[PDB]
Write an enzyme that holds these catalytic residues in place. Sequence first.
Site, PDB file in Angstrom:
ATOM      1  N   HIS A 145       0.837  -1.180   0.000  1.00 51.13           N
ATOM      2  CA  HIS A 145       0.000   0.000   0.000  1.00 51.13           C
ATOM      3  C   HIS A 145       0.878   1.237   0.000  1.00 51.13           C
ATOM      4  O   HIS A 145       0.579   2.213   0.690  1.00 51.13           O
ATOM      5  CB  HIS A 145      -0.928  -0.016   1.210  1.00 51.13           C
ATOM      6  CG  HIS A 145      -1.596  -1.337   1.435  1.00 51.13           C
ATOM      7  ND1 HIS A 145      -2.869  -1.615   0.984  1.00 51.13           N
ATOM      8  CD2 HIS A 145      -1.163  -2.460   2.057  1.00 51.13           C
ATOM      9  CE1 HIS A 145      -3.193  -2.850   1.323  1.00 51.13           C
ATOM     10  NE2 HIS A 145      -2.176  -3.385   1.974  1.00 51.13           N
ATOM     11  N   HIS A 169     -10.348  -0.619  -9.487  1.00 54.26           N
ATOM     12  CA  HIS A 169     -10.201  -0.791  -8.055  1.00 54.26           C
ATOM     13  C   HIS A 169     -11.594  -0.840  -7.419  1.00 54.26           C
ATOM     14  O   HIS A 169     -12.366   0.122  -7.528  1.00 54.26           O
ATOM     15  CB  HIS A 169      -9.384   0.394  -7.531  1.00 54.26           C
ATOM     16  CG  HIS A 169      -9.127   0.372  -6.056  1.00 54.26           C
ATOM     17  ND1 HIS A 169      -8.232  -0.493  -5.467  1.00 54.26           N
ATOM     18  CD2 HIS A 169      -9.617   1.141  -5.056  1.00 54.26           C
ATOM     19  CE1 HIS A 169      -8.197  -0.270  -4.165  1.00 54.26           C
ATOM     20  NE2 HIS A 169      -9.027   0.720  -3.890  1.00 54.26           N
TER      21      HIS A 169
END
Lengths: 372, 372, 376, 376
Positions: free
Chosen positions: B186, B286
């Site tokens: 991330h 996403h």
Amino acid sequence: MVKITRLTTYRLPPRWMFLKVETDEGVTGWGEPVIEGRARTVEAAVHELSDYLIGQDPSRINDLWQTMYRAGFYRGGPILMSAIAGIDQALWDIKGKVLGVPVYELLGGLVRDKMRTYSWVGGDRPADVIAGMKALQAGGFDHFKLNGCEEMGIIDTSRAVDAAVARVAEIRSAFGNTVEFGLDFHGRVSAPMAKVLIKELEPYRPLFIEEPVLAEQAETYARLAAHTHLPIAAGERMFSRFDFKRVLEAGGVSILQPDLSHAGGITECVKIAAMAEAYDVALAPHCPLGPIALAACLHVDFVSWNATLQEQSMELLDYVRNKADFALEGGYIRPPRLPGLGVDIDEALVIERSKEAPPVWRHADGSVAEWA
Amino acid sequence: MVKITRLTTYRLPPRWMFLKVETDEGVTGWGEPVIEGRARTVEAAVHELSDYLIGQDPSRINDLWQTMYRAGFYRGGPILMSAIAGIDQALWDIKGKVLGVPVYELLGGLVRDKMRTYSWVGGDRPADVIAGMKALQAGGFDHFKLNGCEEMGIIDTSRAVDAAVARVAEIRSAFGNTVEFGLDFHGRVSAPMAKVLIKELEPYRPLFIEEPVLAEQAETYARLAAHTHLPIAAGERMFSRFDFKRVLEAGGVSILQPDLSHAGGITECVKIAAMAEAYDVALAPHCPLGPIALAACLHVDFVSWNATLQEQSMELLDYVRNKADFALEGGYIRPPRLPGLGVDIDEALVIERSKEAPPVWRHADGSVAEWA
Amino acid sequence: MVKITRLTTYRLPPRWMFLKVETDEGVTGWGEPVIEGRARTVEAAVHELSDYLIGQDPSRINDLWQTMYRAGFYRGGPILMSAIAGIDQALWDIKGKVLGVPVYELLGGLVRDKMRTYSWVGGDRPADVIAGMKALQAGGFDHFKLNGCEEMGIIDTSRAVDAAVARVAEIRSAFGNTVEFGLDFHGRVSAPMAKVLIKELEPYRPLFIEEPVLAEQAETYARLAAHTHLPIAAGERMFSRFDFKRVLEAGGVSILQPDLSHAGGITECVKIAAMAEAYDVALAPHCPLGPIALAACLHVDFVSWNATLQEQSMGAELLDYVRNKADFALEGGYIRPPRLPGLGVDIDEALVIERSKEAPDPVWRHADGSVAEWAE
Amino acid sequence: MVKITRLTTYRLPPRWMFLKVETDEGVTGWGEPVIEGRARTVEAAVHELSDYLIGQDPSRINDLWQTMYRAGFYRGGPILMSAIAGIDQALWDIKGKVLGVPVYELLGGLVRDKMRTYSWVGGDRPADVIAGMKALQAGGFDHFKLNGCEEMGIIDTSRAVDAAVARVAEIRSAFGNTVEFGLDFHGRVSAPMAKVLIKELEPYRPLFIEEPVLAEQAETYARLAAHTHLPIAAGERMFSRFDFKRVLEAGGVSILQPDLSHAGGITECVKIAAMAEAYDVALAPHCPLGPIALAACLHVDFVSWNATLQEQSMGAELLDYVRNKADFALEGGYIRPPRLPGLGVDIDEALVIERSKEAPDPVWRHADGSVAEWAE
Ligand SMILES: [Cl-]
Ligand SMILES: [Cl-]
Ligand SMILES: [Cl-]
Ligand SMILES: [Cl-]
């Protein structure tokens, strides 16, 4: 003054089309455009372009080429450049016949005495490919082209990379470095998988990687070449000097493969060859076609110092009366001998097989797959 | 003339927000903005943008989109684009309902029959991840997304590179090449460690590396991609075509991941998809969110030829009455069936769970850590 | 161990928002985010960010800035950076009051003794603008900002270019080179007309052309700048160092105009100013705002050698909320450094609370009905 | 499960081709490929592509577009993209009739309420052009397109540049800045004369210079644009997004002019328009064609915020094949959105079949006998 009198097209039982250009002097030229898949469209194009030819002196190939290319429409892509290529071949065939010499003699004469060829070899198993290569190895061949893709569909996963790599691994094990082979993906590698596939093929040292992905941008080849020692081949899907300049300027292509029956014929392919030499790029003309297209390719090869390999598909010799002119010793072909393109076409056979003249691949998700 | 009458927001018990757009005809649209972490700010934004909607014809999605985007303020970043995305989804939901068809039928119809999905799989041990993957492998899945980062905190040392690499090594050993997995850092990899980590992961061939570092410059992806065969995925933190153009022009991103609930909704995501196709970049939207956001993602996937994989988080189906429409066979999802987005929202359940509606990570040295 | 105890927001008459940060030691800081147009969203952002502040020591401005910027969310944008900016101003106000000095003394001290200011001048017709400029000229001002166009409507035809030029020509004729004026176009020129407009303005020598078009590409300003000798100003629509670096790398901009109330406050704008100095770009901070934002601008100007001109909205309403009005007095268009500790504003808090209770609350379209890009 | 049953082509008097797609439910779509000059080849392409259509559900326009574009052959080119464009228009016509709404309602709805149009005006001498412009001006038009040169012959000498400029000067003198005109050069200027011609045209302020030379290189327009303030228009000779991206990356073009009848139809042109918006390039779609191509253009214009001007060939013959003539009426040069379902054209099919039965069917050279590049 010689004048063009008639053009005739002939669709032929594999996936070929021949064209015949007749003049009032009885000198006849033959040409071979690429139809594969859009035969009626290319034929129509040939006949529309015929309007610029009928009544004209075929000696003025440059004028006629420029007229067809720029004078009555937008500049050609895949259809128009194929029609132009076919006509151009026939015009050169005529000029050579009128002047009594092979075409290469017109274009400055020989730069070499014989030309190295390579043959496509197929087969369902890797055993079937090995067997095909061994039989040609007995016939003096040591250079080959193989499909890189085993399975039907695209290389999309690690599993599918490994299967294609293992097939090549088995083919290479049977010969070591005694043979050279190029690998032709027909664009059937996904962009994400291209670089891992190319890296995995490096131990097996293929002669080139041909059309790994389909180039959306001119930068893509340069970016691929930066990652590998393996030479990249491309050119099949490019139709003029204007298309090829883009690719040459970026670099990344080691071996240029224009198609004589697509990229505007001899007139344009000689220019593509010269352009390529100035970028230190080798020429290996794309020729999976018939004898007329192959003869055209040979004339370019025999005048261009940078030509290295000539693909041939030896069937094509059916329509040719002078078959021995195209015989191969040790993988090498000799310069064509007869005037013009050097092909004595069996016109009677062409007429008969043209009288009796008659798909979409999808991915698993139903989406259309790009043409091979 | 149909007119928008009211917008209502609903904060929901995980970390979701739904919005409801009502019209005077009784046709109701649903939308799902990203709130994660700034829920009150996004909600306020939605209600401020509501000023451009009340009294207006919702058929004019393009006008309303442009009005919200450019007409009354500076062009949006992460807050405004999320509010716009939520409203846009609802507007498309309305249009589909008015015209009686799924949204993809409005946007030119199907380009594919089913869409390949992948699922995030968690677990504390590598044993826990293997176990989760094996249970989904029984349910037809062969494509997964894993967190790349094992330990809490950033990959900063050789020790921390080796631990993450060993975790992946153990996961790969349990399957070989029978499954594909992407790895999501991330942004929790330090810039100095990025290249060694990526090189060490190469033997285990993940499908992509998602957000390895947080891109300060557009050049960073291109520079990373030059070093590796592994595909890089990015897009989560980009909010408009103007942001994505920068990334596409530099190259280095193989797989684009815009978020439908962040990047300005269907209207903008269809444009991002088309833009991406012109750079030969695949789309993998996403979607770690709820059912409305997932439906929006599917409509884009089913009209965009370059869409390859759809993330899903199957919980989301709680608020959906038509659960079977989102069922998965062999990892594949079908096109939504009902009009609009294709989600029959249990509005009563939404109201009740919205009535009962209620951190900072730091490095060892006390400095704040960038959000995951 | 001082702690922040409370944040309170106030919406005020000239569409300004003030913000007040209180601490347990009774030391209060003031900040001014920019709200023009999304007041409720920015106000909500400020209170959401307040979660990172309550209970914390306001002396750690760097930690608090970094926490608000990158800790709980995606970075940046016009909403969050404006909330952050107003909060950062108040934290600096606190630090200065705590250490008993103006903010500039903290950031390395004075680099100059006074700062050249300039004001916007409006007017329906050229005669009105000329008169306003002359009224300000009798006060020592020789630097001005004017709207590039009469008023609303995009410059998209040769007729519109010609009217805009004719106005500028008339204004220039009244003064010759005795005054400087910048021209603000608010992005209200179509891209096709941009170059001809700039070329036709050249004889009248504006000091700068500010935001002629909206920066779609990185190369937009650089391409315009290669065509002209006129300085281009931009930056009011950029909200972080990361936005400004792109513009500075490409070039094309001669005068950077970050907004202290939009671009992450003092902490960020001092770094923007230093970045600019390295590209030899002048700093002229954007400030059409209240006295708190102006004071914040001044502190950046007084520590940044590359600062050249400070915009102010003074040309009395700005001074309404300030009790120490004399600290902002102008002599020859120059302003002195702020005198009191912190930002140097003595906020009439009771006047603020009063005017906040009575604060109440558009879209422009082309002839064809399509929305026009936002302007003010 | 609706199926396409038949495609039929019709060649018509003003060298137009119409195309009709029939389905088993009796819902018919119309399309208009561009044929100018290679009619038989484009007609053959349409019938070859028909193999991908017969038996298929026309609702899957995206699938059918992708199948025609990339499935059986090499991509693109002037022939195939024109065949594809005409077919794509008819499929959209079908979808709209099926769902009972104009095509723009499908593609996200109106972004504007009307669309500015403009017409080509011809004339042998400047007096004739002026008169034609004035006749159109009495109808509310203030935007025009003119040929940049008198007629055939390449501008390759200073004499030729000067005559072309003198014509423009005369036309400009009759109007001052009260009208806008673009100049179409049809690539008929030699590369050596391009820059001087553009420079000498600058005082007379054309709205755009359209296709001054033939784009050999990617950098050609970008190089020209760095020399001038005049907007450059191009795109009529580009046939896909992949062609347009190259031009947009390099820059140099201010106004993109894709042809709905050449560049892969509605499906592709909406993506071209969106691509353009990201580079801040205006959309002015090329349309010297019939009512079907014009309707297709309008649908793109009504969903694309960056669309600025729509060319039409109306300045009666266009309306000959349309029964719903009032839907294309012009007020102040503006056109309304199409009203009927699909493309919004009620095609006089019996008139089409009639005029198709009676349709019958050059090369220009320099003084030295060499061929001149194609112009119209
Ligand atoms: Cl073509
Ligand atoms: Cl925002
Ligand atoms: Cl924001
Ligand atoms: Cl073509």
